[PDB]
Amino acid sequence: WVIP
Amino acid sequence: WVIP
Amino acid sequence: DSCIQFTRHASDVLLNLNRLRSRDILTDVVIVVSREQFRAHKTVLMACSGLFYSIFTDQLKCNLSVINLDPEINPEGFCILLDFMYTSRLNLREGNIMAVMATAMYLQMEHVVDTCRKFIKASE
Amino acid sequence: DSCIQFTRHASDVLLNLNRLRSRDILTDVVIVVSREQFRAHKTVLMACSGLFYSIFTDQLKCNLSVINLDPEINPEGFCILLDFMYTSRLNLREGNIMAVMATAMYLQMEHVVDTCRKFIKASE
Ligand SMILES: O=C1Cc2cc(Nc3nc(Cl)ncc3F)ccc2N1
Ligand SMILES: O=C1Cc2cc(Nc3nc(Cl)ncc3F)ccc2N1
Ligand SMILES: [Cl-]
Ligand SMILES: [Cl-]
């Protein structure tokens, strides 16, 4: 999961 | 395009 | 093999599948979550959810145009997960995390269940 | 928004859509390319090809279970492009590049047309  |  | 690969292809396919959903193009099922209705593509639901994979591989249920979910399922939680299926983006907030996690456990979306557990653990 | 994003989601969705195709699950169209038949999902074809997008958004054609392509289309070229749609990998070879490029121009797959033009230019 990432900060888009 | 890339070499997978 | 000796194939070449287009890096952005999968993301571009998903973006177009979400544009078809927005425009109600070739949607073939309605998911009912109490008083709310959500239109979607059976194939996208099956590709994202272990519950929908089991439903639409069943010889009788594969033919249904309407699926009613358990009344304990929160429509907002379902809406957030449906958006995730079509976009890869999860709108996870302090006010919805419990409903989102409960819905993801029901739909069998293991990667979502994993991130919810981690965010809950961080708060404790 | 304040969303989080699962990097591998789109690739995982496409992989599952290819597993449904392999297992002939919920395929809803047959594409006929001379003596050969290819089963696929209309939504994946529309998401990848400008020609299929135009076909399945047409009020009469959206209801067809069989689509016949132009007889000049090479079945091997089509097979390579169908595999690309479901996998992002293009099996481009000196012996098939002309058929693949001609099929991609017909199907309106601009990114494939672009890589074929570049590989052809490199050979000259
Ligand atoms: O957490 C999850 C997400 C998920 C999706 C699927 N989907 C499919 N699985 C296979 Cl093997 N082939 C085709 C499919 F559409 C099954 C189980 C699970 N569990
Ligand atoms: O080279 C290409 C690939 C391609 C795909 C599509 N697909 C769709 N386009 C839109 Cl705007 N919404 C939904 C779709 F399924 C249209 C044109 C083109 N041209
Ligand atoms: Cl997931
Ligand atoms: Cl393309």
CSV table of N, CA and C in Angstrom, one decimal, chain D residues 23-64:
chain,number,residue,atom,x,y,z
D,23,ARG,N,-10.3,-20.8,-18.0
D,23,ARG,CA,-11.3,-21.7,-17.5
D,23,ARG,C,-12.6,-21.6,-18.1
D,24,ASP,N,-12.7,-20.7,-19.2
D,24,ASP,CA,-14.0,-20.3,-19.9
D,24,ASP,C,-15.1,-19.9,-19.0
D,25,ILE,N,-14.8,-19.1,-17.9
D,25,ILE,CA,-15.7,-18.6,-17.0
D,25,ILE,C,-16.3,-17.3,-17.4
D,26,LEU,N,-17.6,-17.2,-17.5
D,26,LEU,CA,-18.3,-16.0,-17.9
D,26,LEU,C,-17.9,-15.3,-19.2
D,27,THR,N,-17.2,-16.0,-20.1
D,27,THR,CA,-16.9,-15.5,-21.4
D,27,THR,C,-18.3,-15.3,-22.1
D,28,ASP,N,-18.4,-14.2,-22.8
D,28,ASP,CA,-19.8,-13.9,-23.3
D,28,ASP,C,-19.7,-13.5,-24.8
D,29,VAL,N,-18.6,-13.8,-25.5
D,29,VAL,CA,-18.5,-13.5,-26.9
D,29,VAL,C,-17.5,-14.5,-27.6
D,30,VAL,N,-17.8,-14.8,-28.8
D,30,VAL,CA,-16.8,-15.6,-29.6
D,30,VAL,C,-16.4,-14.6,-30.8
D,31,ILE,N,-15.1,-14.5,-30.9
D,31,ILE,CA,-14.5,-13.7,-32.0
D,31,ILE,C,-14.1,-14.7,-33.1
D,32,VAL,N,-14.6,-14.5,-34.3
D,32,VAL,CA,-14.3,-15.4,-35.4
D,32,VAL,C,-13.3,-14.7,-36.4
D,33,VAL,N,-12.1,-15.3,-36.6
D,33,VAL,CA,-11.1,-14.8,-37.4
D,33,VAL,C,-10.7,-16.0,-38.4
D,34,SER,N,-11.5,-16.0,-39.5
D,34,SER,CA,-11.6,-17.0,-40.6
D,34,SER,C,-12.0,-18.3,-40.0
D,35,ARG,N,-11.2,-19.4,-40.0
D,35,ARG,CA,-11.5,-20.7,-39.5
D,35,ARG,C,-11.3,-20.8,-38.0
D,36,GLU,N,-10.8,-19.8,-37.3
D,36,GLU,CA,-10.6,-19.9,-35.9
D,36,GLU,C,-11.6,-19.1,-35.1
D,37,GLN,N,-11.9,-19.6,-33.8
D,37,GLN,CA,-12.8,-19.0,-32.8
D,37,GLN,C,-12.0,-18.7,-31.6
D,38,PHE,N,-12.3,-17.5,-31.0
D,38,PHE,CA,-11.6,-17.1,-29.7
D,38,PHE,C,-12.7,-16.7,-28.8
D,39,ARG,N,-12.8,-17.2,-27.6
D,39,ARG,CA,-13.8,-16.8,-26.6
D,39,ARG,C,-13.1,-15.8,-25.7
D,40,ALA,N,-13.9,-14.8,-25.3
D,40,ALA,CA,-13.4,-13.7,-24.5
D,40,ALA,C,-14.5,-13.0,-23.7
D,41,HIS,N,-14.1,-12.0,-22.9
D,41,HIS,CA,-15.1,-11.2,-22.1
D,41,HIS,C,-15.2,-9.9,-22.9
D,42,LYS,N,-16.4,-9.5,-23.3
D,42,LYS,CA,-16.7,-8.3,-24.0
D,42,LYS,C,-16.0,-7.1,-23.3
D,43,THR,N,-16.1,-7.0,-21.9
D,43,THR,CA,-15.6,-5.8,-21.2
D,43,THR,C,-14.1,-5.7,-21.4
D,44,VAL,N,-13.4,-6.8,-21.4
D,44,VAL,CA,-11.9,-6.8,-21.5
D,44,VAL,C,-11.5,-6.3,-22.9
D,45,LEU,N,-12.3,-6.9,-23.9
D,45,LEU,CA,-12.0,-6.4,-25.3
D,45,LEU,C,-12.3,-4.9,-25.5
D,46,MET,N,-13.3,-4.4,-24.9
D,46,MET,CA,-13.7,-3.0,-25.0
D,46,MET,C,-12.6,-2.1,-24.3
D,47,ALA,N,-12.1,-2.6,-23.1
D,47,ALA,CA,-11.2,-1.8,-22.4
D,47,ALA,C,-9.8,-1.7,-23.1
D,48,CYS,N,-9.5,-2.6,-24.0
D,48,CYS,CA,-8.2,-2.7,-24.7
D,48,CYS,C,-8.2,-2.2,-26.2
D,49,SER,N,-9.4,-2.2,-26.8
D,49,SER,CA,-9.4,-2.0,-28.3
D,49,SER,C,-10.5,-1.0,-28.6
D,50,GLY,N,-10.1,0.0,-29.4
D,50,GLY,CA,-11.0,1.1,-29.9
D,50,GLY,C,-12.1,0.5,-30.8
D,51,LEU,N,-11.7,-0.6,-31.6
D,51,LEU,CA,-12.7,-1.2,-32.4
D,51,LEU,C,-13.8,-1.9,-31.6
D,52,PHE,N,-13.3,-2.7,-30.6
D,52,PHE,CA,-14.3,-3.4,-29.7
D,52,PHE,C,-15.1,-2.5,-28.9
D,53,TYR,N,-14.5,-1.3,-28.4
D,53,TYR,CA,-15.3,-0.3,-27.7
D,53,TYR,C,-16.4,0.2,-28.6
D,54,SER,N,-16.2,0.5,-29.9
D,54,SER,CA,-17.2,1.0,-30.8
D,54,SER,C,-18.3,-0.1,-31.1
D,55,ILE,N,-17.9,-1.4,-31.2
D,55,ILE,CA,-18.8,-2.5,-31.4
D,55,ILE,C,-19.7,-2.7,-30.3
D,56,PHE,N,-19.2,-2.8,-29.1
D,56,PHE,CA,-20.1,-3.2,-28.0
D,56,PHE,C,-20.8,-2.0,-27.3
D,57,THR,N,-20.5,-0.7,-27.8
D,57,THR,CA,-21.3,0.4,-27.3
D,57,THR,C,-22.4,0.7,-28.3
D,58,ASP,N,-22.5,-0.1,-29.5
D,58,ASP,CA,-23.5,0.1,-30.5
D,58,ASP,C,-24.7,-0.7,-29.9
D,59,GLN,N,-25.9,-0.1,-30.0
D,59,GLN,CA,-27.2,-0.6,-29.4
D,59,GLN,C,-27.5,-2.0,-30.1
D,60,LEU,N,-27.3,-2.2,-31.3
D,60,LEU,CA,-27.6,-3.5,-32.0
D,60,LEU,C,-26.5,-4.6,-31.7
D,61,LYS,N,-25.2,-4.2,-31.9
D,61,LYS,CA,-24.1,-5.1,-31.8
D,61,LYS,C,-23.7,-5.6,-30.4
D,62,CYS,N,-24.0,-4.8,-29.4
D,62,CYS,CA,-23.8,-5.1,-28.0
D,62,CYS,C,-24.4,-6.4,-27.6
D,63,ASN,N,-25.5,-6.9,-28.3
D,63,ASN,CA,-26.2,-8.1,-28.0
D,63,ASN,C,-25.8,-9.3,-28.8
D,64,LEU,N,-24.8,-9.2,-29.7
D,64,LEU,CA,-24.3,-10.3,-30.4
D,64,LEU,C,-23.4,-11.2,-29.6
